[PDB]
Coordinates of C-alpha atoms (C1' of nucleotides) and ligand atoms in Angstrom, one line a residue:
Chain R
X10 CA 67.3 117.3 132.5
X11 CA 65.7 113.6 133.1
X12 CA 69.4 112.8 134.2
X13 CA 69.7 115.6 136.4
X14 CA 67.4 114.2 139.0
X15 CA 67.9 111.7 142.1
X16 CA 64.6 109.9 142.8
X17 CA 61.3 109.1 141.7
X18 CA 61.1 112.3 141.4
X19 CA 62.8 111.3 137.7
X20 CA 59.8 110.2 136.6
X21 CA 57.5 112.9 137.2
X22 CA 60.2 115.3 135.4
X23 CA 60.3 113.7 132.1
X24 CA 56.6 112.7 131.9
X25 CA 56.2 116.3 132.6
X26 CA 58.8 116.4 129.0
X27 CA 56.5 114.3 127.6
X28 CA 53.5 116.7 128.2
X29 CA 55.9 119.2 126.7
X30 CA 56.7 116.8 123.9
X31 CA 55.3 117.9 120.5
X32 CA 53.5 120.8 121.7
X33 CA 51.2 118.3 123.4
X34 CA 48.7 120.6 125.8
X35 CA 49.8 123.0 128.5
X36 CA 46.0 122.7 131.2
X37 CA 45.3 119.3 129.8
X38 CA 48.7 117.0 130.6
X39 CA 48.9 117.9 134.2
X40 CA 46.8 115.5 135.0
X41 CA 49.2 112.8 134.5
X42 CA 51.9 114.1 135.6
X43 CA 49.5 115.2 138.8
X44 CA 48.2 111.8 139.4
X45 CA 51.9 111.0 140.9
X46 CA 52.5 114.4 142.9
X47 CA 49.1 114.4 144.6
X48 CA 49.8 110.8 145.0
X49 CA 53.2 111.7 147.0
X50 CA 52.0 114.7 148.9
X51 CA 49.4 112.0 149.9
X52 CA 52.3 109.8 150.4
X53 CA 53.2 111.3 153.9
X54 CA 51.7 112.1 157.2
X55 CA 51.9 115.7 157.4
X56 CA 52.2 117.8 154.4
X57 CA 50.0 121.5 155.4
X58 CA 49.1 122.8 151.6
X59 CA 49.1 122.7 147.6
X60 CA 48.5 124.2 145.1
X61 CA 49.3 122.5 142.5
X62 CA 47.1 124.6 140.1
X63 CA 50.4 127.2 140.2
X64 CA 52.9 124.7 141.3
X65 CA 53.0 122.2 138.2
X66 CA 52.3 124.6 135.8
X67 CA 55.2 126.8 136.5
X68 CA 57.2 123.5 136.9
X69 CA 56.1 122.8 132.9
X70 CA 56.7 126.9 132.6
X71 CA 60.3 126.7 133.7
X72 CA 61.5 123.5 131.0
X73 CA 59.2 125.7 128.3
X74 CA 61.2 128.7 128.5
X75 CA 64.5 126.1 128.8
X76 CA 63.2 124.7 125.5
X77 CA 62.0 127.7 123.9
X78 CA 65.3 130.0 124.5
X79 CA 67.3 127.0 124.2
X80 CA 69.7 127.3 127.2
X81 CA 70.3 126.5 130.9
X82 CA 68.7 129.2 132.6
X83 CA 71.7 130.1 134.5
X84 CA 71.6 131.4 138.3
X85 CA 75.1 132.3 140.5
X86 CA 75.6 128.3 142.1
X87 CA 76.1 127.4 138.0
X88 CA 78.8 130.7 138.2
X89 CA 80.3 129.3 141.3
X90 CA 80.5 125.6 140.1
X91 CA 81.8 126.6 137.0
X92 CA 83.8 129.1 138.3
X93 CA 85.5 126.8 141.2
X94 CA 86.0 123.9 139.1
X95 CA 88.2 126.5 136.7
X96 CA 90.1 127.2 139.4
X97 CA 90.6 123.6 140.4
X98 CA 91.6 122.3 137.0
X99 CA 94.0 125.3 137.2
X100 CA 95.3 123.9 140.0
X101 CA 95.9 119.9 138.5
X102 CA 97.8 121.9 135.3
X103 CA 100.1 123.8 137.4
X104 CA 101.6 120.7 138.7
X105 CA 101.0 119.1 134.9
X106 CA 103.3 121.9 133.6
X107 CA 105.8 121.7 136.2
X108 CA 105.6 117.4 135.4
X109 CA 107.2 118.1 132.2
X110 CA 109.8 121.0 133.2
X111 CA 107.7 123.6 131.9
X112 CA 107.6 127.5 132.4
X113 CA 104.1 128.9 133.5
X114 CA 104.1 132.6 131.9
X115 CA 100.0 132.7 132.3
X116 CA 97.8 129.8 133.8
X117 CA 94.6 130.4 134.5
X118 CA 91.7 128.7 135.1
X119 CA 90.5 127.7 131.1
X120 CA 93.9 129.3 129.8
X121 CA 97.2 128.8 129.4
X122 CA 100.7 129.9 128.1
X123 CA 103.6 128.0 129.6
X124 CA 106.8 126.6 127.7
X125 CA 108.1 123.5 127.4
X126 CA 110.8 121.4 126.0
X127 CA 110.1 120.2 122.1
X128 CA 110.5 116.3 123.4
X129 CA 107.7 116.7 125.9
X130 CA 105.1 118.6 124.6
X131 CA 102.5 116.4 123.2
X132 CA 102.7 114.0 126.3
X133 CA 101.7 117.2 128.4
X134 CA 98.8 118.4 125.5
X135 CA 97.5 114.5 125.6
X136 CA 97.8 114.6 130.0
X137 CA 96.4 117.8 130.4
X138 CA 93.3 117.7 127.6
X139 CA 92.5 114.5 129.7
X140 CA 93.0 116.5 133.2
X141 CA 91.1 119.2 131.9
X142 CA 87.8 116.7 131.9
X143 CA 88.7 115.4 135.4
X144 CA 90.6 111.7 133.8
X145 CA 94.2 111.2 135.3
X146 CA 95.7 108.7 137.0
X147 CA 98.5 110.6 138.5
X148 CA 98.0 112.5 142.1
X149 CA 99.1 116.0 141.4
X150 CA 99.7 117.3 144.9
X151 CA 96.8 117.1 147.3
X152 CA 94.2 116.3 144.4
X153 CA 93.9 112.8 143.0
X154 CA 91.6 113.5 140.0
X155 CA 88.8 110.8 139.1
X156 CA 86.9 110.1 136.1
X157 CA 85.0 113.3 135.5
X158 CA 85.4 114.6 138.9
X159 CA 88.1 116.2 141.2
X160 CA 88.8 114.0 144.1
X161 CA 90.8 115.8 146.9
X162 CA 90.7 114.0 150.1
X163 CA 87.0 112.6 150.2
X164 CA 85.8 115.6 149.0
X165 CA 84.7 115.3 144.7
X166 CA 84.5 118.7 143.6
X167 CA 83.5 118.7 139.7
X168 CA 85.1 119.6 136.6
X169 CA 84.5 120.3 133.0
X170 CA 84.3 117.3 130.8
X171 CA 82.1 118.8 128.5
X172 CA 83.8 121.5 127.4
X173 CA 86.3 121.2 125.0
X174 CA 89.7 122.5 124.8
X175 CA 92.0 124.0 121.6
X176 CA 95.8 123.5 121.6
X177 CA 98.8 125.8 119.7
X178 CA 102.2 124.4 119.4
X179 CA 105.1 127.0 118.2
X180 CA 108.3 124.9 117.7
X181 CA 110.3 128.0 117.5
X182 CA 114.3 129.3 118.2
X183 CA 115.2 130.5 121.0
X184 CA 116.6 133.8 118.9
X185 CA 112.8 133.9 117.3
X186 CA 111.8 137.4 118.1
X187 CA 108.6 136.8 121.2
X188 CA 106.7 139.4 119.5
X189 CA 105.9 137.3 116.2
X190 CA 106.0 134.0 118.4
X191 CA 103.5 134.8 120.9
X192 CA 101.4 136.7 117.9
X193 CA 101.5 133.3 116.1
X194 CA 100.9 131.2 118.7
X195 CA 97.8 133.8 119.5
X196 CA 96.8 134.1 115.7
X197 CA 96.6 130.1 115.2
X198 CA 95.0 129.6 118.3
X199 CA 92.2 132.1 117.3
X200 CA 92.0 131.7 113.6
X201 CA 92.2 128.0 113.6
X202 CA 89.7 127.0 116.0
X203 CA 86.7 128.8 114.1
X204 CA 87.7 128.2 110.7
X205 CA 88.3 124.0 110.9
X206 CA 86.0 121.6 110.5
X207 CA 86.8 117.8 110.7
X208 CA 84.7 115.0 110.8
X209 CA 82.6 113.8 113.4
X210 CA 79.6 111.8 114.4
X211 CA 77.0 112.2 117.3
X212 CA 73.7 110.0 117.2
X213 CA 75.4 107.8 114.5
X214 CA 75.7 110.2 111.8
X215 CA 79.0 112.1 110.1
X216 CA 78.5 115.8 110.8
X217 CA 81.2 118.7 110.7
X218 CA 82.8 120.1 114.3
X219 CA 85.3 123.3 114.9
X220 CA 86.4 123.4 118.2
X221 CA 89.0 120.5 120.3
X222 CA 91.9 120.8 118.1
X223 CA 95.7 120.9 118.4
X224 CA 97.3 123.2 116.0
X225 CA 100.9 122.6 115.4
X226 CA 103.5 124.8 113.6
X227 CA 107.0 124.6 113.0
X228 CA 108.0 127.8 110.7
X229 CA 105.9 126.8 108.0
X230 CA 104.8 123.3 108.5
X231 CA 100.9 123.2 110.5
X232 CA 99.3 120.2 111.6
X233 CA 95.9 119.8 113.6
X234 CA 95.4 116.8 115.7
X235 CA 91.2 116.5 116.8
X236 CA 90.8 116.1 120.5
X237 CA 87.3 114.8 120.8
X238 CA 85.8 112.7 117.5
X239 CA 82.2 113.2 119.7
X240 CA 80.5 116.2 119.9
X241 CA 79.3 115.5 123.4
X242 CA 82.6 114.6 124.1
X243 CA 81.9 112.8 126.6
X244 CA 78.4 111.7 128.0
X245 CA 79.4 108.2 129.0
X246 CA 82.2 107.0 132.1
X247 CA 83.6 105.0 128.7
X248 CA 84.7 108.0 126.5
X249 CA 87.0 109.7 129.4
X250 CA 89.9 107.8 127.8
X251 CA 88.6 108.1 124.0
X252 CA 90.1 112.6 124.8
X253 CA 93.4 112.8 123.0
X254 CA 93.0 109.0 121.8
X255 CA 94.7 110.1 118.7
X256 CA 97.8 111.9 120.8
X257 CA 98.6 108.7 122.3
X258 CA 98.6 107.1 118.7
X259 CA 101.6 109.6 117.5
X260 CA 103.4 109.2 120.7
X261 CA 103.7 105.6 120.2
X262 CA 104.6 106.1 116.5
X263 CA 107.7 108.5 118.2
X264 CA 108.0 106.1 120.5
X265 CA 108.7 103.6 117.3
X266 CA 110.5 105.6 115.4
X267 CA 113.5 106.8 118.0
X268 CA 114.4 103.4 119.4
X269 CA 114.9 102.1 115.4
X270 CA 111.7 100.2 114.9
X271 CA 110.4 102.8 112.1
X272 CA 112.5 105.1 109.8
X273 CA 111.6 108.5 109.3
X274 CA 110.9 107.7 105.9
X275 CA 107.8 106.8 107.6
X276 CA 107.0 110.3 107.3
X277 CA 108.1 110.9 103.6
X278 CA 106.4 107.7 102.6
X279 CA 102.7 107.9 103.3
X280 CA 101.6 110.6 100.3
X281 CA 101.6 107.9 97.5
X282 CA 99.4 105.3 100.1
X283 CA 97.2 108.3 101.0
X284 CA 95.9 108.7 97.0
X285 CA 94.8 104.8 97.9
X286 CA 93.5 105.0 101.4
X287 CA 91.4 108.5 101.2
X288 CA 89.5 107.0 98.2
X289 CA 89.4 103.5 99.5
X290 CA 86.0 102.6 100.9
X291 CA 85.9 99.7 103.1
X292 CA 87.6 99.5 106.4
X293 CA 90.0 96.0 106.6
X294 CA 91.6 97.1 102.9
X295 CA 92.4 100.5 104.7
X296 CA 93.9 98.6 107.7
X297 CA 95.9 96.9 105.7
X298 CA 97.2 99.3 103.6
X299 CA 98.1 101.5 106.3
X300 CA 99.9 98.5 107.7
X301 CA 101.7 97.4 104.7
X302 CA 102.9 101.3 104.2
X303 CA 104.1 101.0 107.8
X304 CA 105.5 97.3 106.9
X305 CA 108.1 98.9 104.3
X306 CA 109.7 101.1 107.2
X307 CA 108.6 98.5 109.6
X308 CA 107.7 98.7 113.2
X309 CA 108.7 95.6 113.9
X310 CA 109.1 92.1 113.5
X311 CA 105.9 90.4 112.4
X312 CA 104.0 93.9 113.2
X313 CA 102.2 94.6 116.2
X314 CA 101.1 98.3 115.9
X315 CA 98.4 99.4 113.5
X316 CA 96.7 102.9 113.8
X317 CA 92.9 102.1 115.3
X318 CA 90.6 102.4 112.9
X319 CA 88.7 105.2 113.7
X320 CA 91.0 107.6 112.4
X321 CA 90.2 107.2 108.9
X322 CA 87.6 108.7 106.8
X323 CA 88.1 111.9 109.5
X324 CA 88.4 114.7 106.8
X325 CA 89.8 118.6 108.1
X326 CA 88.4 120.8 106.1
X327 CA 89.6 124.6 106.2
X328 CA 88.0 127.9 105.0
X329 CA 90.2 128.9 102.4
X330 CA 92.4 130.1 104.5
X331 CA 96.3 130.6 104.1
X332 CA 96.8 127.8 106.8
X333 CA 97.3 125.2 104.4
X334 CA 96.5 121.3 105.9
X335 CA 96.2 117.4 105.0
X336 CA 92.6 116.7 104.2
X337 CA 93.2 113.8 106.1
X338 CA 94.1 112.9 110.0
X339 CA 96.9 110.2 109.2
X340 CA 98.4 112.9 106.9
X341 CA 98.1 115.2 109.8
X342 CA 99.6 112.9 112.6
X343 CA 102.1 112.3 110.1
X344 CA 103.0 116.2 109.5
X345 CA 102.7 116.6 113.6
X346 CA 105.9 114.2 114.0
X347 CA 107.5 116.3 111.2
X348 CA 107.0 119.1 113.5
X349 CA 107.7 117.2 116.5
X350 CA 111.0 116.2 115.2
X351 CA 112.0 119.2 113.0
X352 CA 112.2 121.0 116.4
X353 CA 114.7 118.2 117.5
Chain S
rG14 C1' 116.6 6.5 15.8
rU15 C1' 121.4 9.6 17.0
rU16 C1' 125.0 14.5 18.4
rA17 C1' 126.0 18.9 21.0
rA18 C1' 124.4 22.7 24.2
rG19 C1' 121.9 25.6 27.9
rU20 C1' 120.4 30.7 27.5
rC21 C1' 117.8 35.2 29.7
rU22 C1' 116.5 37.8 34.8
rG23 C1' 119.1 38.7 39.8
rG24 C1' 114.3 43.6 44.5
rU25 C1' 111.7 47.7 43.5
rU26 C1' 108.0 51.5 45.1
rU27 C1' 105.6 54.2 49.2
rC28 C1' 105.5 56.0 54.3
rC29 C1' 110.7 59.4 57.6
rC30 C1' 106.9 61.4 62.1
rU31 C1' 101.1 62.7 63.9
rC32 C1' 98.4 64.8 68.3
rC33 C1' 98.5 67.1 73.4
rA34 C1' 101.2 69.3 77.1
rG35 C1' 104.9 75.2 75.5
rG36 C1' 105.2 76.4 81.9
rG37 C1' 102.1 75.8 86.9
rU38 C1' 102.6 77.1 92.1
rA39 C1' 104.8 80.4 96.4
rU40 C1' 107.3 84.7 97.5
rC41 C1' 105.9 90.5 94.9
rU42 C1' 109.9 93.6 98.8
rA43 C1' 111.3 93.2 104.2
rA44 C1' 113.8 95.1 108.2
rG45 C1' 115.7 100.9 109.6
rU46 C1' 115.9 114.9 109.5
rU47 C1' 120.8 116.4 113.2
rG48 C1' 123.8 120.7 113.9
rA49 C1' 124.8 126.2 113.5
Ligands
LIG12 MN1 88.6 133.7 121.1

RNA sequence: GUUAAGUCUGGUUUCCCUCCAGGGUAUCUAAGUUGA
């Protein structure tokens, strides 16, 4: 709300917060909050009326009911906006499909069901989960996204880099029966989402979170891959690139492993390390075990690529379900190249 | 006062090693699922 503004007019809104702050005084408060509207209707030369009496309580009205429901009161231009900025993003993945020779068999607006190759698949998850919240660098036709936005020719329509967005992989055969495959690919994408929780933290403290996944199954191997790690995904211009930070992470390791930097052993290798590492405790012995685990299938000479840090202590829970999973998200990037590869 | 004649023996006994140091340091592994 405070943010929402463009002016001085900031400072009347949140003072006005304030006198709704702790269930201050409704009658009393707008006095303060009054001293500075009276002061700017008194701040010009011709203003005819006010009556402020109605005017600033109904202002305090409108953020009480917003407080006390506990939602944006919605009215049709939030509709439209969200509505056209659907339809927009709809647009940028059309041509983010047909970047990776893909096969559009629904795309619309939030959704999607296209098919791709097995080799390009998590480039277009990583490209599109950062498209979807307006940050590209590519020009995708006519529309040049930026940062949040939707730049097409001078003109910035918005986009939705608040919500999140879920991801379902099928690796299957082309003889796999599309009944089962698209009921799969349905089932995970439904079941999954709601019944995972991995580890995140907003205002500086480790809480659970269920949506902004990537689900991954190769007939019987599942992997999830969190999108977000921030639960306000993004509320700075600095966390546009921090979406599908962890895709990037197992596209390099792929990136390792093909031109003969890494062995795949690298992916048979890390369950006797992950014992150590998911009860280990501080965070430079964890870096350097992960590094040494890597440094006996190698990634180089005198290694250059280490994972970043933030991806340990994330813990996926599930519940109880029969989609078994790593507790762990370097288990999990680990069984996503498994998939990756075992559909190769 | 005088005569003669030398004869016996032919190195023993101790101590033969004592004390400390009995491994130290560095490397501790690197580099690397595909087809029906
Ligand atoms: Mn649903």
């Amino acid at each position: 709300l405070v943010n929402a503004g463009s002016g001085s007019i900031v400072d009347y809104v949140k003072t006005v917060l304030k006198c709704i702050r702790e269930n201050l005084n409704k009658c009393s408060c707008a006095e303060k909050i009054y001293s500075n509207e009276v002061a700017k209707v008194m701040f010009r030369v011709n203003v005819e009326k006010a009556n402020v009496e109605e005017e600033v309580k109904n202002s305090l009205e409108y953020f009480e009911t917003i407080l006390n429901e506990g939602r944006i009161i919605v009215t049709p231009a939030w509709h439209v906006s969200i509505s056209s900025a659907l339809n927009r993003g709809l647009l940028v993945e059309l041509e983010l499909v047909n970047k990776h020779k893909g096969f559009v068999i629904y795309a619309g607006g939030d959704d999607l069901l296209a098919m791709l190759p097995v080799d390009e698949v998590l480039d277009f998850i990583k490209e599109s989960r950062r498209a979807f919240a307006g940050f590209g660098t590519e020009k995708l036709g006519n529309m040049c996204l930026e940062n949040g936005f939707v730049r097409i020719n001078n003109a910035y329509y918005p986009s939705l880099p608040i919500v999140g967005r879920s991801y379902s992989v099928i690796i299957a055969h082309y003889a796999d029966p599309l009944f089962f495959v698209i009921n799969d690919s349905y089932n995970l994408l439904e079941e999954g989402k709601e019944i995972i929780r991995y580890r995140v933290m907003y205002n500086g403290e480790y809480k659970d979170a269920k949506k902004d996944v990537a689900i991954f199954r190769y007939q019987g191997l599942t992997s999830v891959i969190p999108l977000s790690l921030k639960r306000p995904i993004v509320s700075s211009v600095s966390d546009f690139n921090e979406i599908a930070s962890i895709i990037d992470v197992i596209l390099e390791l792929k990136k390792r492993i093909d031109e003969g930097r890494i062995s795949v052993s690298l992916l048979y290798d890390y369950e006797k390390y992950k014992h150590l590492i998911v009860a280990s405790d501080e965070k430079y012995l964890t870096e350097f075990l992960v590094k040494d685990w890597i440094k006996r299938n190698s990634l180089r000479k005198h290694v250059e690529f280490t994972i970043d840090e933030k991806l340990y202590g994330v813990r996926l829970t599930i519940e109880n379900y029969p989609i078994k999973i790593p507790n762990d998200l370097i288990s999990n990037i680990v069984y996503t190249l498994r998939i990756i590869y075992g559909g190769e």
